[PDB]
RNA sequence: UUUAUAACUUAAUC
RNA sequence: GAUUAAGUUAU
């Protein structure tokens, strides 16, 4: 479960990056924070919460 | 030849940078020195016409750039523009305690010597 | 109760904790003398021993000293890591409250030596005879002679006290008008750069009776030992003068009648003022060499830039070269789902497995580059115990006796890779290939000869790396100018090649781990220690926290092979160029120019070798301190007791180098404290009985040395000790060790963390590395690295190799000792016959 | 816009 | 068996 969450978070940050999210530093800082927190997590519940919080960013824009 | 191309590039850069130098401020600094030799660190400090301030948060802003004019390095500086980390123009009225979390940080303040 | 004493008898010498005349009339009028028929619980030796032998949880004397004199209060020590310079940087403020007491003690010592000189008394001053109020109270060992001709001996006192002068910032009051902290700071003229008279005044105020000549300008020094001696004093005095006076010194010059600004000298914190010898105010035309020199020179760039006030960092800003700040980010890594699906199919990553992913590409936002640069705030001006350092350098130099060196011609320099960055501003037009091709060998030789008579300052550029790790930290690399690199290769490459070509030595740079090399390295370090345990340590913040004294030391040890080709002025300008280029150069970080406080540079040609010198220096310091801090009366062995006595005598009583004792102490370390050193990594095989008796260094001694000399706290959590030599070292160069039966005999094989190899498989930093042609080669490399895992008892570890081989089969299908799809190809990589 | 060194692998060429 | 290129690892 957890490894899938980490691997999905990596590709999710990549797809956000290629959509030029990083040209808005205020949001890119939080995307990076969530990505690093997911990778550093050792429990899948906090990983899921932060993963869905991160995915909401992609869901907000047209994707 | 790459040799001549790089010679031309280096000499062009060296001569282009002189549009700012040889200002009479530089001569006033250098000539009164006992031996005509001065530290490099003081040259922009005493002779630069423009100052760039990079401010991480509002607490540093109130302590450094309150108002439209402020003092630094024994000179008075007047603010020309303020921009955020996204290089978008930020008006002086926007920079407040209540609005601060809405702004992107750091802020870059450019000022001209009075 | 135990108290610290500095002892030198005919029987015992050292500086350790021990269980505890009518000439007073000739000194009673001195106000630095205590009244004899008032004194405090602790002396100056207690403070010196507490800060030189720090141990947390065994530090109640330091706590009592700090709370007695209102540096802090009892509740300050309930904070976690109150003592740690990195986790609690406020501790420097707490120690700085002791500065006035130490400064008053120095002034009272100068008064006491004046009184002794007038009274005609001969005697040796010791720290344990001075109160923490600075009053001197012990006279029993002095000798009368003719009044007006007394001779106070103060070598040990000043030398032992020196590290605390910078830790407490004793000379802070000298920045104030009339040396009074209540009055405002002295305001200097911004154009004043010399300060030689101020340095001499400080020396005579505080070190009047220090017996050796001091040179405010190290260009007047006599050898490298004199350079170290005077640079150590310059470090202390430079804390008084304004920061804007340091760095390149500039002058107006005319070329074609057109005015340039060029650097004609440099003001060093450590080396004083250096002037260039080849300066000509009027020139008709500019050659390619002068074009290169003036393009590298920061004078033009700093003079043409805007003034910069960067509040994000505590470092000194010079100028902004661009109207806009740069906020470069770090991308996340790409995912190799093709390999991940294969791994999950074969049963990895199930819950409860001991093998799990932990190495990732960590993204970084726009603050990363400047946030990482700000860790230079851990670099602090550190004064060294100069007599101890001057002995250590002679012992450290013995580790480098077997290498050849000296200057070479430009036509025989070996440059590994020409298609890489030339640094700023040279990277604006070409790579290193361009400048190596454009310059003839005679132009390169004339540039090298010019740096033996003139200082060329250069600008280093800092760039973020893209690399896998288990840590969130962003890593930057320092790119140095081609102008500096080209001459540094011509100075150092012969010695670097000689080091990298040698086998069986202490420094193991250049030795391969393949084909039995790892086994040979372990059998070399195990050499003949007779109660062997293994030890390894870590330097916290090594690249940032390194004192400038030890970097200058490392540069001088590398330059000792230049006796026949270079004169002493040539060698001094080579050192001045090295300092101005890699120690305290200007850093291009995001389009803005900053002053680097100190520490190493990753892009410097000598970085790994200098770090090896530093690591050896710290280990020899730890051994010397362990030997001198032990109770000499309790040493059972006659030989080691005599060795301790001669060591103390050779540090603080002799000033000529005793080559026979350097030989004997080096032999002693080789016999009992044998080392394997690669950069900042180290494995030591040490005699356990001697370490338990305090005869050789342990982790405790490294902790103390790194506290008082490197300004860091080394926590034992990152250190290790192994008691069984059939086990390997626990951790060396990120490899573990296992004893493996291979053929008819057992060998040591290195093996990586399985998570590291799986991370290198799953994530890549470029999508093009998903192409089968490069992917197959990448997995061959990772299978060569992963192969020893099959010998591991943990079957979860063993399956990591078979996964890689199965994936190589799959890739080869999609597309015998040389056929890399079978295991015999990999087995051959770890057998002696290369 | 991505430094320095070291080792190893692979493919070329006389 | 000597250059050139690419890649991996370590520091
Ligand atoms: P190690 O424990 O990894 O770091 C200590 C020491 O190694 C360097 C050297 N030499 C180092 C590490 C990684 C790199 C890179 N990528 N490039 C250059 N140098 N290094 C540093 O000097 C550091 O202090
Ligand atoms: Mg380290
Ligand atoms: Mg390591
Ligand atoms: Zn000297
Ligand atoms: Zn030489």
In terms of Cα–Cα distance, which of B44, B77, B54 is closest to C326?
B54
Where in C30-132 does DSSP place strands (E)? 121-124
CA distance C537 to B73: 46
Instruction: Write out the two tokens for C564.
Output: 């026949």
CA distance C121 to C112: 11
Strand C151-153 versus strand C586-588 pairing type = unpaired
Q: What angle do CA B10, C245, C595 make, to 5 degrees?
A: 55
Same domain (yes/no): B37, B53: no
- In the block, tokens 């591991």 appear at C792
Q: What one-character-per-residue DSSP string does C622-668 give?
A: HHHHHHHTS-GGG---HHHHHHHHHHHIIIII--S--HHHHHHHHHH
Contacts 24+ apart (CB under 8 A), A37-44: A38/A5, A38/A6, A38/A9, A39/A6, A39/A9, A39/A10, A39/C360, A39/C362, A40/C472, A41/A2, A42/A2, A43/A2, A44/A1, A44/A2, A44/A5
Instruction: Count other C-beta atoms under 10 Å from residue C667's C-beta.
Output: 11
Residue C345 burial class via C-beta count within 10 angstroms: exposed 0-12, middle 13-18, buried 19 and up:
exposed
Cα dihedral value A29, A34, A40, A42, nearest 10: 160
Ligand 1 atom nearest to CA at C607: 10
Backbone angles phi, psi at C633, to 5 degrees: -70, -25
CA distance C589 to C373: 8
Contact C652, C125 (CB under 8 A): no
In terms of Cα–Cα distance, which of C126, C135, C146, C134 is closest to C26?
C146
User: What's C105's DSSP letter?
Assistant: H
Strand C2-8 versus strand C13-19 pairing type = antiparallel
What is the arrangement of strands in the sheet containing B75-83, beginning at the earlier edge strand?
Answer: B69-72, B75-83, B107-113, B50-55, C307-310
Instruction: Please report, for residues C211, C230, C236, C559, C563, the alpha-carbon distance to residue C223 in angstroms, rounded to integers and kept in the order given.
Output: 17, 11, 21, 12, 11
Establish whether C215 is an annotated binding residue.
yes
Contact C739, C792 (CB under 8 A): no
Instruction: Write out the two tokens for B10.
Output: 């280096």
Residue C225 burial class via C-beta count within 10 angstroms: exposed 0-12, middle 13-18, buried 19 and up:
middle
Report how many helices (DSSP H) and strands (DSSP E) chain A contains, helices first: 3, 0
In terms of Cα–Cα distance, which of C200, C469, C429, C209 is closest to C333?
C469
In terms of Cα–Cα distance, which of C88, C430, C456 is closest to C262?
C456
Radius of gyration of chain A (CA): 11
Contact C777, C742 (CB under 8 A): no
Sequence-separated (6 or more) residues with CB below 8 Å from residue C30: C111, C112, C114, C115
CA distance C88 to C108: 33
Nearest residue (CA) to C1' of D6: C510
Tell me the Ramachandran region of residue C250: left when phi exceeds 0, alpha when psi lies from -120 to 50, beta otherwise.
beta
Nearest CA to ligand 1 atom 17: C602
Nearest residue (CA) to C1' of D9: C781
Same domain (yes/no): B38, B55: no
Q: Ligand 1: does its nearest atom lie under 6 Å from the Cβ of C602?
A: yes
Q: Tell if the CB–CB gap between C472 and A40 is shorter than 8 Å.
A: yes
- In the block, tokens 């430079």 appear at C238
Annotated active-site residue C679? The verdict is yes
**Domain layout of chain A by residue ranges:** 1-63
- In the block, tokens 């390194």 appear at C546
Nearest CA in chain B to A21: B86
User: What's C356's DSSP letter?
Assistant: -
Instruction: Write out the two tokens for C464.
Output: 């973020």
Instruction: Count other C-beta atoms under 10 Å from residue C280's C-beta.
Output: 8
In terms of Cα–Cα distance, which of C586, C371, C580 is closest to C461?
C586
Tell me the Ramachandran region of residue C576: left when phi exceeds 0, alpha when psi lies from -120 to 50, beta otherwise.
alpha
Contact C447, C488 (CB under 8 A): no
What technique was this entry resolved by?
Answer: cryo-EM
CA distance C398 to C382: 25
Strand C121-124 versus strand C13-19 pairing type = unpaired
Sign of CA dihedral A36, A37, A38, A40: positive
Strand C307-310 versus strand B50-55 pairing type = parallel
Calculate how close chain A gets to C468, using CA atoms only, in Å: 13
CA distance C659 to C665: 10
Same domain (yes/no): B40, B54: no
Q: What one-character-per-residue DSSP string does C510-536 give?
A: T--STTTHHHHHHHHHTTT-SSEEEEE
Where in the sequence is the domain holding B33, given as residue range(s)?
1-44
Bridge partners (DSSP) of residue C19 are C2
Establish whether C402 is an annotated binding residue.
no
In terms of Cα–Cα distance, which of C708, C671, C431 is closest to C530?
C671
In terms of Cα–Cα distance, which of C536, C525, C573 is closest to C674?
C525
Instruction: Write out the two tokens for B32.
Output: 């009164």
Nearest CA to ligand 1 atom 15: C602
For residue C101, is the peptide bond before it cis, meaning its omega torsion is within 30 degrees of 0? no
Q: Ligand 1: does its nearest atom lie under 6 Å from the Cβ of C476?
A: no
B82 SS3 class: strand
Q: What one-character-per-residue DSSP string does C312-350 give?
A: S-SSPEEEESSSS-----BPPPEE-HHHHHHHHHTTTT-
In terms of Cα–Cα distance, which of C229, C164, C238 is closest to C198?
C238
CA distance C316 to C318: 7
Fold of C386-402+502-546+606-732: Alpha-Beta Plaits (3.30.70)
B104 interfacial to chain A (CB closer than 8 Å): yes
CA distance C755 to C354: 10
Q: Tell if the CB–CB gap between A36 and C333 is shorter than 8 Å.
A: no
Contact C315, C377 (CB under 8 A): yes
Residues of B in contact with A25 (CB under 8 A): 85-86, 104
Instruction: Please report, for residues C173, C174, C461, the alpha-carbon distance to residue C240 in angstroms, rounded to integers and kept in the order given.
Output: 9, 6, 29
Q: What one-character-per-residue DSSP string does C457-495 give?
A: --EEEEEE----BSS----EEEE--HHHHHHHHHHHHHH
Q: What's the total number of domains in chain B? A: 2
CA distance C390 to C344: 59
**Of C481, C584, C674, C679, which is the active-site residue?**
C679
Q: Which nucleotides of D are covered by protein (CB under 7 A)?
A: 1-10
**Nucleotide closest to residue C500 (CA–C1'):** D6
CA distance C299 to C593: 11
- In the block, tokens 């401020």 appear at B25
Contact C368, C329 (CB under 8 A): yes
CA distance C702 to C712: 11
Annotated active-site residue C60? The verdict is no
Side-chain half-sphere CA neighbours of C162 within 13 A: 26
In terms of Cα–Cα distance, which of C775, C764, C760 is closest to C807?
C775
Residues of A in contact with C362 (CB under 8 A): 35-36, 39
- In the block, tokens 């004078």 appear at C299
Q: Which nucleotides of E are covered by protein (CB under 7 A)?
A: 5-11
CA distance C800 to C339: 12
CA distance C802 to C783: 9
Strand (E) or helix (H) holding C274: strand C272-275
> For chain B, what percentages of helix, strand and coil (3-state, to nearest 5) are there?
40, 25, 35
Range list of H helices, B1-114: 2-16, 24-31, 42-47, 58-64
Contact C38, C183 (CB under 8 A): no
Backbone angles phi, psi at C267, to 5 degrees: -105, 110
Strand (E) or helix (H) holding C114: helix C99-119
Establish whether C733 is an annotated binding residue.
no
CA distance C442 to C25: 74
In terms of Cα–Cα distance, which of C275, C104, C270 is closest to C199?
C270
Sign of CA dihedral B56, B57, B61, B64: negative
Instruction: Count other C-beta atoms under 10 Å from residue C254's C-beta.
Output: 13
Give the closest ligand to the alpha carbon of residue C232. 4
Same domain (yes/no): B53, B40: no
CA distance C361 to C332: 6
Establish whether C230 is an annotated binding residue.
yes
- In the block, tokens 């005609």 appear at C120
Q: What one-character-per-residue DSSP string does C158-198 give?
A: HHHHHHHHHHTTGGGGGGBGGG-TTSPBP---TT----HHH
CA distance C713 to B53: 35
Instruction: Write out the two tokens for C815.
Output: 């597309």
Range list of H helices, C247-348: 288-296, 298-304, 337-345
In terms of Cα–Cα distance, which of C234, C232, C297, C294 is closest to C267?
C234
CA distance C593 to C229: 32
Side-chain half-sphere CA neighbours of C301 within 13 A: 27
In terms of Cα–Cα distance, which of C562, C288, C283 is closest to C442?
C288
Q: Which residues of C747-774 are buried (b: 16+ CB within 10 A; e: fewer)?
A: bbbbbbbbbbbbbbbbbbeeeeebeeee
Contact B45, B87 (CB under 8 A): no
CA distance C340 to C357: 11
User: What's C788's DSSP letter?
Assistant: G
Q: Ligand 1: does its nearest atom lie under 6 Å from the Cβ of C372?
A: no
Nearest CA to ligand 1 atom 8: C602
Contact C573, C452 (CB under 8 A): yes
The residues of chain C that CATH labels 3.30.70.270 are: 386-402+502-546+606-732
In terms of Cα–Cα distance, which of B99, C118, C43 is closest to C34?
C43
CA distance C415 to C490: 11
Q: Which residues of C261-274 are buried (b: 16+ CB within 10 A; e: fewer)?
A: bbbbbbbbbbbbbb
Residue C224 burial class via C-beta count within 10 angstroms: exposed 0-12, middle 13-18, buried 19 and up:
buried
Distance CA C483 to C1' D4 in A: 15
Same domain (yes/no): B33, B13: yes
Contact C73, C81 (CB under 8 A): no
Instruction: Write out the two tokens for C425.
Output: 């501003």
* Residues found in chain A: 63
Instruction: Please report, for residues C114, C480, C511, the alpha-carbon distance to residue C498 in angstroms, rounded to integers and kept in the order given.
Output: 53, 24, 12
Instruction: Count other C-beta atoms under 10 Å from residue C649's C-beta.
Output: 14
Range list of H helices, C168-304: 196-206, 224-237, 288-296, 298-304
CA distance C202 to C233: 10
Instruction: Write out the two tokens for C394.
Output: 């002679």
CA distance C480 to C461: 7
In terms of Cα–Cα distance, which of C17, C593, C680 is closest to C300?
C593
User: What's A60's DSSP letter?
Assistant: H
Instruction: Write out the two tokens for C70.
Output: 């209102």
CA distance C651 to C631: 18
A5 interfacial to chain C (CB closer than 8 Å): no
CA distance C652 to C647: 9
Contact C126, C153 (CB under 8 A): no
CA distance C645 to C11: 8
- The partner residue sitting opposite A28, judged by closest CB among C329, C333, C351, is C329
Contacts 24+ apart (CB under 8 A), C193-197: C193/B37, C193/B38, C193/B39, C193/C245, C193/C249, C193/C267, C193/C273, C194/C273, C195/C237, C195/C241, C195/C245, C196/C272, C196/C273
CA distance C675 to C681: 10
Instruction: Write out the two tokens for C121.
Output: 């008394």
Maximal C-alpha separation, chain A: 32
Instruction: Count other C-beta atoms under 10 Å from residue A39's C-beta.
Output: 25
- The partner residue sitting opposite C329, judged by closest CB among A22, A35, A39, is A22
CA distance B111 to C146: 70
Resolution (A): 2.5
Bridge partners (DSSP) of residue C152 are C123
Contacts 24+ apart (CB under 8 A), C790-795: C791/C738, C791/C740, C791/C749, C791/C751, C792/C738, C792/C751, C794/C354
Contact C543, C614 (CB under 8 A): no
Same domain (yes/no): B111, B91: yes
Annotated active-site residue C765? The verdict is no
């Amino acid at each position: 479960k957890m490894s899938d969450v980490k691997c999905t978070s990596v590709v999710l940050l990549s797809v956000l990056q290629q959509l030029r999210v990083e040209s808005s530093s205020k949001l890119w800082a939080q995307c990076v924070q969530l990505h690093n927190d997911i990778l550093l997590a050792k429990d899948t519940t906090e990983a899921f919460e932060k993963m869905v919080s991160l995915l909401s960013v992609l869901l907000s824009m047209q994707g | 030849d790459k040799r001549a191309k790089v010679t031309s590039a280096m000499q062009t850069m060296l001569f282009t940078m002189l549009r700012k130098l040889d200002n009479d401020a530089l001569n006033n600094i250098i000539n009164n020195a006992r031996d005509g030799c001065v530290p490099l660190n003081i040259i922009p400090l005493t002779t630069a016409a423009k100052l760039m301030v990079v401010i991480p948060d509002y607490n540093t802003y109130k302590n450094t750039c309150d108002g439209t004019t402020f003092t630094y390095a024994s000179a008075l500086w007047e603010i020309q523009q303020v921009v955020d980390a996204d290089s978008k123009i930020v008006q002086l009225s926007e920079i407040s305690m209540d609005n601060s979390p809405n702004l992107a940080w750091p802020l870059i303040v450019t000022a001209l010597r009075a | 109760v135990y108290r610290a004493f500095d002892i030198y008898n005919d029987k015992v010498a050292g500086f350790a904790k021990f269980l505890k005349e009518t000439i007073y009339n000739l000194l009673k009028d001195c106000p630095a003398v205590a009244k004899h028929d008032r004194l405090t619980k602790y002396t100056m030796a207690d403070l010196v021993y507490a800060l030189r032998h720090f141990d947390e949880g065994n530090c109640d004397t330091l706590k009592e000293i700090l709370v007695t004199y209102n540096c802090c209060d009892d509740d300050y020590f309930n904070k976690k890591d109150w003592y740690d310079f990195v986790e609690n940087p406020d501790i420097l403020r707490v120690y700085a409250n002791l500065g006035e007491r130490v400064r008053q003690a120095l002034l009272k010592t100068v008064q006491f030596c004046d009184a002794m000189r007038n009274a005609g008394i001969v005697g040796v001053l010791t720290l344990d005879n001075q109160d923490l109020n600075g009053n001197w109270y012990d006279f029993g060992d002095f000798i009368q002679t003719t009044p007006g001709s007394g001779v106070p001996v103060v070598d040990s006192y000043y030398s032992l006290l020196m590290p605390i002068l910078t830790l407490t910032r004793a000379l802070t009051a000298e920045s104030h008008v009339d040396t009074d902290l209540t009055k405002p700071y002295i305001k200097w003229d911004l154009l004043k750069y010399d300060f030689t008279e101020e340095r001499l005044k400080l020396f005579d105020r505080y070190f009047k009776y220090w017996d050796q000549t001091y040179h405010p300008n190290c260009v007047n020094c006599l050898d490298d030992r004199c350079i170290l001696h005077c640079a150590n004093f310059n470090v202390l005095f430079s804390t008084v003068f304004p920061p804007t006076s340091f760095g390149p010194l500039v002058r107006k010059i005319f070329v074609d009648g057109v005015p340039f600004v060029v650097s004609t000298g440099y003001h060093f914190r450590e080396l004083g003022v250096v002037h260039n010898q080849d300066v000509n105010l009027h020139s008709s035309r500019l050659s390619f060499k002068e074009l290169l020199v003036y393009a590298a020179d920061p004078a033009m760039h700093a003079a043409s830039g805007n003034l910069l006030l960067d509040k994000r960092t505590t470092c000194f800003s010079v100028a902004a070269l661009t109207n806009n700040v740069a906020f470069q980010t770090v991308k996340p890594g790409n995912f190799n789902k093709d390999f991940y699906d294969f791994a999950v199919s074969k049963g990895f990553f199930k819950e409860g497995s001991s093998v799990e992913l932990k190495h990732f590409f960590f993204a970084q936002d726009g603050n990363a580059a400047i946030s990482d640069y700000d860790y230079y705030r851990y670099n602090l001006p550190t004064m060294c115990d100069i007599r101890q350092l001057l002995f250590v350098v002679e012992v450290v130099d013995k580790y480098f006796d077997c290498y050849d060196g000296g200057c070479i011609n430009a036509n025989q320099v070996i440059v590994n890779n020409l298609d890489k960055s030339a640094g700023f501003p040279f990277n604006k037009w070409g790579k290193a290939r361009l400048y190596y091709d454009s310059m003839s060998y005679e132009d390169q030789d004339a540039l090298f000869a010019y740096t033996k008579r003139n200082v060329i300052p250069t600008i280093t550029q800092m760039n973020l790396k893209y690399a896998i790790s288990a840590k969130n930290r962003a890593r930057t690399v320092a790119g140095v100018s081609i102008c500096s690199t080209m001459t540094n290769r011509q100075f150092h490459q012969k010695l670097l090649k000689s080091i990298a070509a040698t086998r069986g030595a202490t420094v193991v740079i250049g030795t391969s781990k393949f084909y039995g090399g790892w086994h040979n390295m372990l059998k070399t370090v195990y050499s003949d220690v007779e109660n062997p345990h293994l030890m390894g340590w870590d330097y916290p913040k090594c690249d940032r926290a390194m004192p400038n004294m030890l970097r200058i030391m490392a540069s001088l040890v590398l330059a000792r092979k230049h006796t026949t080709c270079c004169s002493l002025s040539h060698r001094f300008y080579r050192l001045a160029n090295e300092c101005a280029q890699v120690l305290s150069e200007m850093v291009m970080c995001g389009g803005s120019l900053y002053v680097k406080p100190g520490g190493t540079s990753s892009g410097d040609a000598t970085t790994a070798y200098a770090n090896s010198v530093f690591n050896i220096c710290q280990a020899v310091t730890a051994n010397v301190n362990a030997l001198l801090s032990t109770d000499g009366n309790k040493i059972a062995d006659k030989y080691v007791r005599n060795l301790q006595h001669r060591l103390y005598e050779c540090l603080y009583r002799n000033r000529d180098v005793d080559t026979d004792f350097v030989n004997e102490f080096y032999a002693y370390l080789r016999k009992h404290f044998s080392m394997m050193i690669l950069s900042d990594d180290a494995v030591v095989c040490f005699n356990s009985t001697y370490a338990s008796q305090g005869l050789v260094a342990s982790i405790k001694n490294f902790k103390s040395v790194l506290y008082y000399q490197n300004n860091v706290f080394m926590s034992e959590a990152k250190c290790w000790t192994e008691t069984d030599l059939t086990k390997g070292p626990h951790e060396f160069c990120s490899q573990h060790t296992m004893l493996v039966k291979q053929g008819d005999d057992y060998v040591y094989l290195p093996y990586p963390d399985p998570s590291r190899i799986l991370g290198a498989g799953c994530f890549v930093d470029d999508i093009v590395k998903t192409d089968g042609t490069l992917m197959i080669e990448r997995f061959v490399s990772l299978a060569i690295d992963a192969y020893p895992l099959t010998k591991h008892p943990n079957q979860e570890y063993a399956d990591v190799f078979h996964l890689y081989l199965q994936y190589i089969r799959k890739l080869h299908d999609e597309l015998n000792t040389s056929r890399y799809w079978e295991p015999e190809f990999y087995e051959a990589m770890y057998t002696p016959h290369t």
